Ligand binder design. Structure first.
Ligand SMILES: c1cc(-c2c[nH]c3cc4cnccc4cc23)ccn1
Ligand SMILES: [Zn+2]
Length: 328
């Protein structure tokens, strides 16, 4: 059976909710559970009302996200193919109720301060179902940190972390993110100097520059285990491929070209495309505490420029991580 909203979000948890993000198919709140920060994603399912410009997902249409979230969450505890560069999934519930006024309050504050593209979620009836995913808290997204990084050395760490994470998921799960815009890259402060990953049994380190990167939001993602493929089939979707105003929206069309609109197949080139979009963002749309005025910064910039103009000649995140000069 579904449980009441109160079972997942009792009052003290609701009272500490702060909205941190959104999309067509999800509101995301930060809160505290057992004195520990968490991020809660809430998705309306199975209901008749339009929400945020779409029909609601069915339970079946949400399973891919749940499954892929569970799989990627495993990767921090594996051995041969191991990374912390995804996000932990703690729990999944099916909840029933109208939307809690306290969530509406936090939604309102977000709308007042950052602005929303979503409908105010205030029209759901007390029979409405939602999926509630509780994740580990992964930090602040790269878009909101676009004026906050220390230098291009930090950016280099971020690219390396992302490439490694995607490589490990490629090797373990034939994973493609398929929607890795800069909202889906989280940064968190760490006092670790060196982050560790293991790819096909070989362990390596990455200088952190004080950040841990987490890749989030598996709504468009694809993977497989033992020949069973889990993905979001967008072969008939029209909107996803007619965006403009940002390279982000070319990526969707370039992915479609690479895979011939067959979304069940494995095309890890999609990870390269996203990494290219991210590198592009770092070179064009970011401001740094240290400017381009030292030999070191000139060199790292030159290297990231060389990465930008050569990376699309590689076939996967694995290929980039193993072969590209940037990571040597
Ligand atoms: C839209 C926005 C988001 C989103 C923005 N900022 C976030 C921070 C999180 C931290 N940890 C874990 C998950 C988190 C999720 C988000 C996710 C999905 N769709
Ligand atoms: Zn429970």
């Amino acid at each position: 059976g579904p449980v009441p909203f109160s079972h997942c979000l009792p009052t003290e948890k609701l009272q500490r909710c702060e909205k941190i993000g959104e999309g067509v198919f999800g509101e995301v709140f930060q809160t505290i559970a057992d004195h520990t920060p968490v991020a809660i994603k809430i998705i309306a399912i199975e209901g008749p009302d339009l929400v945020n410009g779409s029909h609601q997902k069915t339970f079946e249409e949400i399973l891919p996200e749940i499954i892929i979230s569970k799989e990627l969450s495993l990767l921090s505890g594996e051995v041969c193919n191991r990374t912390e560069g995804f996000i932990g999934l703690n729990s999944v519930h099916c909840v029933q109720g109208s939307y809690p006024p306290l969530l509406l309050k936090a939604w309102d504050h977000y709308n007042s301060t950052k602005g929303s593209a979503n409908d105010r979620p205030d029209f759901f009836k007390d029979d409405q179902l939602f999926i509630v995913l509780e994740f580990e808290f992964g930090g602040i997204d790269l878009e909101q940190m676009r004026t906050k990084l220390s230098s291009l050395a930090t950016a280099k760490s971020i690219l390396h972390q992302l490439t490694a994470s995607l490589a490990v998921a490629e090797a373990s799960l034939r994973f493609e993110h398929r929607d890795l815009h800069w909202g889906n890259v989280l940064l968190k402060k760490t006092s670790l100097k060196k982050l560790h990953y293991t790819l096909n049994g070989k362990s390596s380190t990455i200088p952190s520059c004080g950040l841990q990167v987490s890749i989030i939001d598996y709504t468009l993602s694809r993977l497989e285990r033992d020949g069973i493929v889990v993905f979001c089939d967008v072969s008939m979707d029209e909107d996803l491929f007619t965006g403009d105003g940002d390279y982000q929206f070319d990526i969707y069309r370039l992915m479609k070209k690479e895979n011939n609109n067959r979304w069940g197949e494995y095309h890890p080139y999609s990870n390269v495309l996203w990494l290219h979009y991210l590198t592009d963002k770092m070179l064009k749309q970011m401001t740094f505490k240290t400017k381009c005025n030292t030999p070191a910064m000139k060199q790292i910039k030159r290297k990231i420029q060389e990465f930008h103009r050569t990376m699309l000649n590689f076939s996967s995140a694995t290929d980039l991580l193993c072969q590209h000069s940037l990571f040597k």
